[PDB]
Design an enzyme around this catalytic site. Structure first.
Site, PDB file in Angstrom:
ATOM      1  N   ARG A 227       1.077  -0.823  -0.206  1.00  0.00           N
ATOM      2  CA  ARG A 227      -0.055   0.228   0.117  1.00  0.00           C
ATOM      3  C   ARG A 227       0.689   1.495  -0.275  1.00  0.00           C
ATOM      4  O   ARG A 227       1.588   1.097   0.948  1.00  0.00           O
ATOM      5  CB  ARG A 227      -1.030  -0.204   1.484  1.00  0.00           C
ATOM      6  N   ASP A 229       2.070   4.866   0.222  1.00  0.00           N
ATOM      7  CA  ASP A 229       1.147   5.960   0.771  1.00  0.00           C
ATOM      8  C   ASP A 229       1.589   7.703   0.038  1.00  0.00           C
ATOM      9  O   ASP A 229       2.699   8.055  -0.313  1.00  0.00           O
ATOM     10  CB  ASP A 229       1.998   6.513   2.239  1.00  0.00           C
ATOM     11  N   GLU A 257      -2.862   5.681  -1.861  1.00  0.00           N
ATOM     12  CA  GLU A 257      -4.206   6.724  -1.430  1.00  0.00           C
ATOM     13  C   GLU A 257      -4.421   7.813  -1.698  1.00  0.00           C
ATOM     14  O   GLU A 257      -2.568   8.526  -1.534  1.00  0.00           O
ATOM     15  CB  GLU A 257      -3.474   6.685   0.184  1.00  0.00           C
ATOM     16  N   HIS A 327      -7.389   4.969   8.779  1.00  0.00           N
ATOM     17  CA  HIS A 327      -6.371   5.569   9.981  1.00  0.00           C
ATOM     18  C   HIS A 327      -6.608   6.917   9.578  1.00  0.00           C
ATOM     19  O   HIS A 327      -6.412   7.947  10.217  1.00  0.00           O
ATOM     20  CB  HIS A 327      -4.799   5.110   9.801  1.00  0.00           C
ATOM     21  N   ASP A 328      -7.401   7.530   7.649  1.00  0.00           N
ATOM     22  CA  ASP A 328      -7.446   8.361   8.102  1.00  0.00           C
ATOM     23  C   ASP A 328      -8.658   9.653   8.421  1.00  0.00           C
ATOM     24  O   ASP A 328      -8.830  10.520   7.559  1.00  0.00           O
ATOM     25  CB  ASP A 328      -6.515   9.310   7.055  1.00  0.00           C
TER      26      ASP A 328
HETATM   27  C1  LIG Z   1       2.235  11.882   5.674  1.00  0.00           C
HETATM   28  C2  LIG Z   1       0.483  11.185   5.754  1.00  0.00           C
HETATM   29  O1  LIG Z   1       0.079  10.179   4.524  1.00  0.00           O
HETATM   30  C3  LIG Z   1      -0.942  10.155   4.362  1.00  0.00           C
HETATM   31  O2  LIG Z   1      -2.187  10.255   3.988  1.00  0.00           O
HETATM   32  C4  LIG Z   1      -1.766  11.754   2.559  1.00  0.00           C
HETATM   33  C5  LIG Z   1      -2.664  10.377   1.006  1.00  0.00           C
HETATM   34  O3  LIG Z   1      -1.895   9.010   1.618  1.00  0.00           O
HETATM   35  C6  LIG Z   1      -2.308  11.450   0.380  1.00  0.00           C
HETATM   36  O4  LIG Z   1      -2.157  10.987  -1.065  1.00  0.00           O
HETATM   37  C7  LIG Z   1      -3.152  12.494  -0.344  1.00  0.00           C
HETATM   38  O5  LIG Z   1      -3.830  12.710  -0.434  1.00  0.00           O
HETATM   39  O6  LIG Z   1      -2.762  13.292   1.497  1.00  0.00           O
HETATM   40  C8  LIG Z   1      -3.015  13.196   2.245  1.00  0.00           C
HETATM   41  C9  LIG Z   1      -2.072  13.646   3.752  1.00  0.00           C
HETATM   42  O7  LIG Z   1      -0.582  13.448   3.646  1.00  0.00           O
HETATM   43  C10 LIG Z   1      -1.195   9.004   5.997  1.00  0.00           C
HETATM   44  O8  LIG Z   1      -2.605   8.290   5.648  1.00  0.00           O
HETATM   45  C11 LIG Z   1      -1.489   9.991   6.865  1.00  0.00           C
HETATM   46  O9  LIG Z   1      -2.119   9.720   7.978  1.00  0.00           O
HETATM   47  C12 LIG Z   1      -0.380  10.395   7.094  1.00  0.00           C
HETATM   48  N1  LIG Z   1      -0.093  11.102   8.348  1.00  0.00           N
HETATM   49  C13 LIG Z   1       1.614  10.663   9.212  1.00  0.00           C
HETATM   50  C14 LIG Z   1       2.754  11.469   8.926  1.00  0.00           C
HETATM   51  C15 LIG Z   1       3.030  12.938  10.574  1.00  0.00           C
HETATM   52  C16 LIG Z   1       3.677  13.908   9.563  1.00  0.00           C
HETATM   53  O10 LIG Z   1       4.689  13.663  10.420  1.00  0.00           O
HETATM   54  C17 LIG Z   1       2.007  12.584  11.961  1.00  0.00           C
HETATM   55  O11 LIG Z   1       1.908  14.487  11.658  1.00  0.00           O
HETATM   56  C18 LIG Z   1       2.642  14.858  11.839  1.00  0.00           C
HETATM   57  O12 LIG Z   1       2.566  16.901  11.556  1.00  0.00           O
HETATM   58  C19 LIG Z   1       2.123  18.121  13.100  1.00  0.00           C
HETATM   59  C20 LIG Z   1       2.667  19.195  12.113  1.00  0.00           C
HETATM   60  O13 LIG Z   1       4.288  18.388  12.093  1.00  0.00           O
HETATM   61  C21 LIG Z   1       2.071  17.711  13.922  1.00  0.00           C
HETATM   62  O14 LIG Z   1       1.646  18.887  14.362  1.00  0.00           O
HETATM   63  C22 LIG Z   1       1.512  16.830  14.051  1.00  0.00           C
HETATM   64  O15 LIG Z   1       1.495  16.344  15.619  1.00  0.00           O
HETATM   65  C23 LIG Z   1       2.528  15.073  13.848  1.00  0.00           C
HETATM   66  O16 LIG Z   1       1.785  13.861  14.544  1.00  0.00           O
HETATM   67  C24 LIG Z   1       0.250  12.110  11.637  1.00  0.00           C
HETATM   68  O17 LIG Z   1       0.455  11.560  13.017  1.00  0.00           O
HETATM   69  C25 LIG Z   1       1.123  10.733  10.946  1.00  0.00           C
HETATM   70  O18 LIG Z   1      -0.932   9.763  10.981  1.00  0.00           O
END
Ligand SMILES: C[C@H]1O[C@H](O[C@H]2[C@H](O)[C@@H](O)[C@H](O)O[C@@H]2CO)[C@H](O)[C@@H](O)[C@@H]1N[C@H]1C=C(CO)[C@@H](O[C@H]2O[C@H](CO)[C@@H](O)[C@H](O)[C@H]2O)[C@H](O)[C@H]1O
Ligand SMILES: [Ca+2]
Ligand SMILES: [Ca+2]
Length: 686
Positions: A227, A229, A257, A327-328
């Site tokens: 999968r 990301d 995704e 998860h999203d």
């Molecule tokens: C990086 C994220 O990627 C995925 O979601 C994508 C998707 O695959 C794309 O094609 C779509 O069009 O956009 C979506 C958003 O980018 C995945 O499913 C997400 O859960 C994933 N999130 C991760 C990554 C981070 C980033 O480091 C974490 O967030 C943190 O960043 C913010 C700002 O710095 C902080 O305030 C938070 O507290 C951090 O946790 C997420 O925790 C993690 O889920």
């Protein structure tokens, strides 16, 4: 081997996927748990490690928790080594519990387990006929500030222990340094960094080759699916060469995704599922299913229109992965939501087309808002909830009934709150009736189905208040009243006498790669596979049986072909279109053209003499090219997958509506690298 075998890594329509956040499922080995500030054994700070691991999943496969439910595929958190830092974001501490903040793509995250633990997971899943899908996130490494090198691990990338480099003082340009995205354009979301993550630069040959080497390592470890990301945040031309690396090496089912909002329909999204070589997590399905069964913001005509519309818009709808939450998203079940809503939505997903995914804890009615509250530790492993029983009765039908794994979808009865649809594959049929109204019964009169006469018992055994269906002559059902909240599933299976193709995997590869064609009615004796009008017979057919054929792609010119199977008796199947034969191995070349000024609505495109460049057809030219972040207008640029090791001929052109303006002068030529990366930098020839 049969289409339903665990060894079928190419196609997953007969599977039901259970999506596990490894940390939040079961801590089977406490000795590998993070210590100190990175760990919270009570799992009440949902941004810390709770302790769940690969031994915990092995345990729940062995004691029958997962297999009792009928799960045949597990999708786990990205397995690679992540940064060890506890990052404090304005008071709250955050760790890499989610697997997304990579630092070495060749090693395991030790909180999940050792490389031996991963092997043990692959082998115990396979011994129980469970396939294993891993997340793979090649867009970035981890949180980084080039201004402050002491922050976290400064996005450092290692290769099996060896430091390749960090974000501060990146003299190799392993990373992107264009600032953060505001998400205004796709171009902006690709080359600018998302959040604070160190974006990898896929136009750097070392990064390109390393990521391709690392995915082959995980393929050699026996994974069955990937999968990936953030697919809308990586160059589509690099991702196509990445898919060709997988498909020309060891093809496994891959999906990405690309997030869509409620009633957003994106052409780029559909174009990506149809042309990248990977399929997509079906957000269109998920969002409409939530509007109808959860939020009541649309009714069954909306559901009908999404099932009918998506069967056409996706070129291979049997490869899209469906779900009702993940998860999203906020979990489907709410605090004041009737549990029957979750139970019907799961029955709907399990009997619909595509590859169903169930988010861990759905069967235990977990509720929670968005990240991180949708990732709590699952509260119980109770095997007797109605939701567990609903998955247990229905998930097996994807293996046993080809109408459910592959069939078309036909609405047979409908009104605002009720839909009865039929799935049909040859003479195999499944009929599903759902009444989403929780207090009004529905009077069904006039239902006609493809079922032979008989008294069909609800496969759900009446647990969601379904009933027996009496079918008479001509498939006409005797009238009945569908209970409030009622859901029933009725089915009939038989043999196919004629070849019918239900799925093909991979859908893009060079000559000589073995593809897997699944269906029914192929027969025992080797017949013929047509790629267009080219027949492949005999020894080029690696394997033939009634439900599956494995055949080598013939040495045909690059382009897209229709596939058709003829059994040994000469009876031919339905056409499975859109297969792309590549010209050979792929490399991604950055094309840059200067001094290409355009009018409003006019954009620059690229075409050339190989199929990967559209074979000189303006309607199939590559682009529109980009012109803002890496290079600015009137310089345009684009990352394009192109055949490796040969001299291509090409020209740029401008397009505005129906009008094509070709560059003048002679055709341009370029000799591509054998797998690595390259840049072409040229000037518009009037
Ligand atoms: C990086 C994220 O990627 C995925 O979601 C994508 C998707 O695959 C794309 O094609 C779509 O069009 O956009 C979506 C958003 O980018 C995945 O499913 C997400 O859960 C994933 N999130 C991760 C990554 C981070 C980033 O480091 C974490 O967030 C943190 O960043 C913010 C700002 O710095 C902080 O305030 C938070 O507290 C951090 O946790 C997420 O925790 C993690 O889920
Ligand atoms: Ca542990
Ligand atoms: Ca990117």
């Amino acid at each position: 081997a049969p289409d339903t075998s665990v060894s079928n890594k190419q196609n997953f329509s007969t599977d039901v996927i259970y999506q596990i956040f490894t940390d939040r499922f079961s801590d089977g080995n406490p000795a590998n748990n993070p210590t100190g500030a990175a760990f919270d054994g009570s799992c009440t700070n949902l941004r810390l490690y709770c302790g769940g691991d690969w031994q915990g999943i092995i345990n729940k496969i062995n004691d029958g928790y997962l297999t009792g439910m009928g799960i045949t595929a597990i999708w786990i958190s990205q397995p690679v080594e992540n940064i060890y830092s506890v990052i404090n974001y304005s008071g709250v501490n955050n760790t890499a519990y989610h697997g997304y903040w990579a630092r070495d793509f060749k090693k395991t995250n030790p909180a999940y387990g050792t490389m031996q633990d991963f092997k043990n997971l692959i082998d115990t899943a396979h011994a129980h006929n469970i396939k294993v899908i891993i997340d793979f996130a090649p867009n970035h490494t981890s949180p980084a500030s080039s201004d402050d090198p002491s922050f976290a691990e400064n996005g450092r990338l290692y290769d099996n222990g060896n430091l390749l480099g960090g974000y501060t003082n990146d003299t190799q340009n392993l990373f992107h340094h264009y600032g953060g995205t505001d998400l205004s354009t796709i171009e902006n979301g690709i080359y600018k960094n998302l959040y604070d993550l160190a974006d990898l630069n896929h136009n750097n040959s070392s990064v390109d080759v390393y990521l391709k080497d690392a995915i082959k390592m995980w393929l050699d470890l026996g994974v069955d699916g990937i999968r990936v990301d953030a697919v809308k945040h990586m160059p589509f031309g690099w991702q196509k060469s990445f898919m060709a690396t997988i498909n020309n090496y060891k093809p496994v089912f891959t999906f990405g995704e690309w997030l869509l909002g409620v009633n957003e329909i994106s052409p780029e999204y559909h174009q990506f599922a149809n042309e990248s070589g990977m399929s997509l997590l079906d957000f269109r399905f998920a969002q409409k299913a939530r509007q109808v069964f959860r939020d009541n913001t649309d009714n069954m005509y909306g559901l009908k229109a999404m099932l009918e519309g998506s069967e056409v818009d996706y070129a291979q709808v049997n490869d899209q992965v469906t779900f009702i939450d993940n998860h999203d998203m906020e979990r489907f079940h709410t605090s004041n939501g009737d549990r029957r809503k979750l139970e019907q939505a799961l029955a709907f997903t399990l009997t619909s087309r595509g590859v169903p995914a169930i988010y861990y804890g759905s069967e235990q009615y977990m509720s929670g808002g968005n990240d991180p509250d949708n990732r709590a530790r699952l509260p119980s492993f109770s095997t007797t909830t109605t939701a567990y029983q609903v998955i247990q009765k229905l998930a097996p039908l994807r293996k046993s009934n080809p109408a459910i794994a592959y069939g078309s979808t036909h609405e047979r009865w409908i009104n605002n709150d009720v839909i009865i649809y039929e799935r049909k594959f040859g003479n195999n049929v499944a009929v599903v009736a759902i009444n989403r109204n929780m207090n009004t019964p529905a009077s069904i009169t006039g239902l006609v189905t493809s079922l032979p006469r008989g008294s069909y018992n609800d496969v759900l055994g009446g647990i969601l208040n379904g009933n027996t269906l009496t079918v008479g002559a001509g498939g006409a059902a005797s009238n009945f009243t569908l209970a409030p909240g009622g859901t029933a599933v009725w089915q009939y299976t038989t043999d196919a006498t004629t070849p019918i193709i239900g799925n093909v995997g991979p859908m893009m590869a060079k000559p000589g790669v073995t593809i897997t064609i699944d269906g029914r009615g192929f027969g025992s004796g080797k017949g013929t596979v047509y790629f267009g009008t080219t027949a492949v017979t005999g020894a080029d057919i690696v394997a033939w049986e009634d439900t599956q054929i494995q055949v080598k792609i013939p040495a045909v010119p690059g382009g897209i072909y229709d596939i058709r199977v003829a059994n040994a008796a000469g009876a031919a199947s339905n056409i499975y279109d859109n297969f792309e034969v590549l010209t050979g191995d792929q490399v991604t070349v950055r094309f840059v053209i200067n001094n290409a000024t355009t009018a409003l609505g006019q954009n620059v495109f690229l075409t050339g003499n190989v199929s990967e460049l559209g074979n000189w057809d303006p309607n199939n030219a590559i682009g529109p090219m980009y012109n803002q972040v890496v290079y600015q207008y009137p310089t345009w640029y684009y990352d394009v997958s192109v055949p490796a090791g040969q001299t291509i001929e090409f020209k740029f052109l401008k397009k505005q509506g129906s009008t094509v303006t070709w560059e003048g002068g002679a055709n341009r030529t370029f000799t591509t690298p054998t797998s690595g990366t390259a840049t072409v930098n040229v000037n518009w020839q009037p």
